A paper describes a structure:
The rotating flagellar filament primarily functions as a propeller, acting as an Archimedean screw, and supercoiling of the filament is essential as rotations of a straight filament do not generate thrust. Here, we show the atomic cryo-electron microscopy structures for flagellar filaments from enterohemorrhagic Escherichia coli O157:H7, enteropathogenic E. coli O127:H6, Achromobacter, and Sinorhizobium meliloti, where the outer domains dimerize or tetramerize to form either a sheath or a screw-like surface. A shared feature in all four structures is the formation of symmetrical homodimers between the outer domains of flagellin subunits, with one outer domain rotated 180° relative to the other. These symmetrical dimers are the result of outer domains being able to adopt either an “up” or “down” conformation.
Author numbering:
A (entry chain a): 53 to 499
B (entry chain b): 301 to 350
C (entry chain c): 103 to 151
D (entry chain e): 450 to 499
C-alpha cells in the first residue's frame, strides 16, 4: 500500500507541474493581451482631443482596429498541447492526489474582442453636431389660433394625421404589464358574444379571460385550432383525478398509449376504458359534468360546466392571436390611468394620437412665437425651443446621436480590469499549485 | 382481493355505473373491491384474464 | 491536461498489460495443475493414517 | 474559373498525422517491450522455484 501511495503521489506531483506550465503559458498570453489593451487605451486618449483633422482620425481608427485584430489573433492561435486555453469559458482539472476526487480546477475565460466588448471601437464615427433651428416654414401642421394663454402673438400648430392604428394600440397595451382590455365577439371564446365584459385580466403574460356558459360546443374549435390537433387534459368528478385526451369533441381518448375511454354510468356519468354503454363525446360529457358538478380543467384553461354548457374560469389566449382577432372590431382597451375607445375602426373617438414612441391622448402641440421661433409652452421663460435635423419628427434636442463610442475610456478600463482579474486568478492558481507540489513532495518523502 | 389499483404508477380505480359496473379513476361511488366486482362481472359477463 | 492521443496510448498500454495478466493467469501451471484456473481446493496428506 | 493546385492543400495537418501514427507505433513497441520484460522476470522466478 505504501509503494502504491508513493507512486501515485509522485505522478500527481508531475501532473501538478504540468498544470504549473499551462498556467504560465496562459499568464504570458494574457500579459501580451494586456500590453495591446494599454496601447489601445493610450491611442484612444490621444485621439480624444478635438483639435485633430479627419485624416488623423482615420489613421488612429485604422491602427486601433489593427491592434484589436491582433488581439483577436493572439486569442485565436494561443494553444498548448492541442488545447486552446482562451477559446472557451471552460474548467480544467488537474489530478493532485493519489486517490479519486483530489483535483484542482482552473477557471478559464474565453477572451476576444467580442467578449471584452465594444465590438468595434469606432472612434472615427461622425461625432457631435449642432442641430438646425426650428425652421418655421417646414412645419405644415394643423393651424389653430385658439391661443389658450390669450397672447395675441402666439399661434398653435398641431401635427395631425397621427391617428394611431388598432395594431399600434394593441402593441401599446401589450407593452405594459397589468392592463385592462374589454372586448366582445372574440375568436373561439366569446364568439357567441353572450357576455360582453370579459376584461381578459391581463396579469403577467399572454392575455387571460373569464367567461360564463358560452363555449358549450366551442371546445373543438378553440382547443384544436388546426385540422388534426390533439390536446391533453385532466378530468375529475370530485376527489378522484383522471387523465384524458381530447380531439375535435369526439372520443375522449385516454392519456395512455392506446386506451380509449367510453361514457357510461347513467346517473353518475363516469369514465371507463372498458365501459358498457354508448360512445363518449364531448357534447354528452358536457351535460354529464353539468349534472354531476365535475371539472374538466386543463393546463391552458380551467373549465367546469353547470347544466349543458361549460363555465370558463382561467383561460389564456395567445397574445398575437388575440391581437389579430381584435384588429377590426369594437373594444375599449385601457392602459395605466387612461381609457381608449375603439368602435369598428382605429380611434373611433378620434382621441388617439401617436407621440414620439408612446401612445398619448393629446396631439403634439407646437406654438409659433412672434419672433418666428417654435416653443413647447406659451411662456417664453420655458419651452426649450424645438430644433430640426437628420431625423425629422421635430426633436427638442440640440444634439444628434454620434455613432462613435459613447464612453470609450470607461469601457477600456472595464476591459483592462477584466484582464487583470483573470491575471490575478491565474497567479493565485499558480501559487496554490506550487504549494501543493511542495506539500506533496514532503508527504511522499516522509511516507 | 382489496383495492383494484390501476396499473399506473399511483392511480387508484373506483367502480361506478350501477347497471354497467365500470372502472374509473374518477368514480362517484364507494371504494372498489374484488368481491363485488366478481358479481358485477358475473352479471355483465366480462373477462378479467391475466 | 492530456490530449486524446495520449489517452489512446495509455489505453493501449493498459490493455496490453491486462492481456499480460490474463496470459500469466492461464499459463502458470505446476505439474499438470493450473493453480490459478479454478476456485478449487488442494489436499496435502501430512498424517500417517 | 480556377485551376487545380499541385501544392499540398494542408501540409501541416497531414504531417502531424504522420507523427501521430509513428509515435503510436512506438508506443505499441514500448508496451510490447514492457510485457516481454515482465514475462522474462516471471519465467526466471518460476524456473528457479521449479
Amino acid at each position: 500500500r505504501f509503494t502504491s501511495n508513493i507512486k501515485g503521489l509522485t505522478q500527481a506531483a508531475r501532473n501538478a507541474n504540468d498544470g504549473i506550465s499551462v498556467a504560465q503559458t496562459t499568464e504570458g498570453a494574457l500579459s501580451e493581451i494586456n500590453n495591446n489593451l494599454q496601447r489601445i487605451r493610450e491611442l484612444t486618449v490621444q485621439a480624444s482631443t478635438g483639435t485633430n483633422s479627419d485624416s488623423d482620425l482615420d489613421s488612429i481608427q485604422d491602427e486601433i482596429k489593427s491592434r484589436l485584430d491582433e488581439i483577436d489573433r493572439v486569442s485565436g492561435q494561443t494553444q498548448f498541447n492541442g488545447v486552446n486555453v482562451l477559446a472557451k469559458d471552460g474548467s480544467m482539472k488537474i489530478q493532485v492526489g493519489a486517490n479519486d476526487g483530489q483535483t484542482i480546477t482552473i477557471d478559464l475565460k474565453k477572451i476576444d474582442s467580442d467578449t471584452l466588448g465594444l465590438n468595434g471601437f469606432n472612434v472615427n464615427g461622425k461625432g457631435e453636431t449642432a442641430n438646425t433651428a426650428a425652421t418655421l416654414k417646414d412645419m405644415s401642421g394643423f393651424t389653430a389660433a385658439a391661443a389658450p394663454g390669450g397672447t395675441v402673438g402666439v399661434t398653435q400648430y398641431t401635427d395631425k394625421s397621427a391617428v394611431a392604428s388598432s395594431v399600434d394600440i394593441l402593441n401599446a397595451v401589450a407593452g405594459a404589464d397589468g392592463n385592462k382590455v374589454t372586448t366582445s365577439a372574440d375568436v373561439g371564446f366569446g364568439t357567441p358574444a353572450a357576455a360582453v365584459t370579459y376584461t381578459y385580466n391581463k396579469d403577467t403574460n399572454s392575455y387571460s379571460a373569464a367567461s360564463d356558459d358560452i363555449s358549450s360546443a366551442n371546445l373543438a374549435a378553440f382547443l384544436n385550432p388546426q385540422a388534426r390537433d390533439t390536446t391533453k387534459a385532466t378530468v375529475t368528478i370530485g376527489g378522484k383525478d383522471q387523465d384524458v385526451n381530447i380531439d375535435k369533441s369526439g372520443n375522449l381518448t385516454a392519456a395512455d398509449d392506446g386506451a380509449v375511454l367510453y361514457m357510461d354510468a347513467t346517473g353518475n356519468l363516469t369514465k371507463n376504458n372498458a365501459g358498457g354503454d354508448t360512445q363518449a363525446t364531448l357534447a354528452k360529457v358536457a351535460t354529464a359534468t353539468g349534472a354531476k358538478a365535475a371539472t374538466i380543467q386543463t393546463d391552458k384553461g380551467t373549465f367546469t360546466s353547470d347544466g349543458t354548457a361549460f363555465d370558463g374560469a382561467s383561460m389564456s389566449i395567445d397574445a398575437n392571436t388575440f391581437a389579430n382577432a381584435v384588429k377590426n372590431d369594437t373594444y375599449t382597451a385601457t392602459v395605466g390611468a387612461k381609457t381608449y375607445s375603439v368602435t369598428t375602426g382605429s380611434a373611433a373617438a378620434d382621441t388617439a394620437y401617436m407621440s414620439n414612441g408612446v401612445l398619448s391622448d393629446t396631439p403634439p402641440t407646437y406654438y409659433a412665437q412672434a419672433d418666428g421661433s417654435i416653443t413647447t409652452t406659451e411662456d417664453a421663460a420655458a419651452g426649450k425651443l424645438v430644433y430640426k435635423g437628420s431625423d425629422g419628427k421635430l426633436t427638442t434636442d440640440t444634439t444628434s446621436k454620434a455613432e462613435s463610442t459613447s464612453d470609450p475610456l470607461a469601457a477600456l478600463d472595464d476591459a483592462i480590469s477584466q484582464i487583470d482579474k483573470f491575471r490575478s486568478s491565474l497567479g493565485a492558481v499558480q501559487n496554490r499549485l506550487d504549494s501543493a507540489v511542495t506539500n506533496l513532495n514532503n508527504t511522499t518523502t516522509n511516507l
